[PDB]
Scaffold this active site. Sequence first.
Site, PDB file in Angstrom:
ATOM      1  CD  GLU A 261      -3.000  -0.879   0.295  1.00  0.00           C
ATOM      2  OE1 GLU A 261      -3.842  -1.723   0.138  1.00  0.00           O
ATOM      3  OE2 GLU A 261      -3.049   0.212  -0.368  1.00  0.00           O
TER       4      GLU A 261
ATOM      5  CG  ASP B 223      -7.761   4.209  -4.575  1.00  0.00           C
ATOM      6  OD1 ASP B 223      -8.524   3.511  -3.951  1.00  0.00           O
ATOM      7  OD2 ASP B 223      -8.118   4.692  -5.691  1.00  0.00           O
TER       8      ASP B 223
ATOM      9  CG  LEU C  35     -11.831   4.784   0.343  1.00  0.00           C
ATOM     10  CD1 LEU C  35     -11.293   5.344  -0.970  1.00  0.00           C
ATOM     11  CD2 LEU C  35     -12.931   3.804  -0.016  1.00  0.00           C
TER      12      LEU C  35
ATOM     13  CG  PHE D  28      -6.243  -3.669   4.027  1.00  0.00           C
ATOM     14  CD1 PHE D  28      -5.743  -2.783   3.054  1.00  0.00           C
ATOM     15  CD2 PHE D  28      -6.161  -3.283   5.340  1.00  0.00           C
ATOM     16  CE1 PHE D  28      -5.218  -1.548   3.421  1.00  0.00           C
ATOM     17  CE2 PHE D  28      -5.663  -2.026   5.725  1.00  0.00           C
ATOM     18  CZ  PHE D  28      -5.195  -1.154   4.760  1.00  0.00           C
TER      19      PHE D  28
ATOM     20  CB  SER E 289     -11.249 -18.136  -5.503  1.00  0.00           C
ATOM     21  OG  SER E 289     -10.950 -17.754  -6.806  1.00  0.00           O
TER      22      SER E 289
END
Length: 164
Positions: A11, A20, A32, A104, A117
């Site tokens: 990040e 971002d 955010l 996250f 998945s």
Amino acid sequence: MNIFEMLRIDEGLRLKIYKDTEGYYTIGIGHLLTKSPSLNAAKSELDKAIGRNCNGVITKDEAEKLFNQDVDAAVRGILRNAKLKPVYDSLDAVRRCVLINMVFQMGETGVAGFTNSLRMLQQKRWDEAAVNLAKSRWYNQTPNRAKRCITSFRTGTWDAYKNL
């Protein structure tokens, strides 16, 4: 390597509001602020989150505080989510870190969406899941990060980040 250092690699740290990869208003370590196009909307959110008049800028300490909250909130979110919890519970320590990273970045609801998945990870079908996860907007949008995560689910080691 731990979830904090891992997220910090992905990040980065920025002490001034920034946009971002998606163009949204963010600060610190991927926190955010708003999906709102208004810088003002963003400054407001910021001051609300910090408890002071920040005028778009925070300290390292403030950033790390937001970070501690977000990681805590990501973990608790997984644990409360009925789709996520069982997968988390089934995984080893490294792979658990990988799911927190995903949560996250994309929120609980978003990861909860990767139904096929999740099932593969649960079943410990590493390579198959790696291939499935690559078929996503996530992967095409932030490929280096997605590959790091994906490699990690794949091998169950921190090699992808031992570079960085």
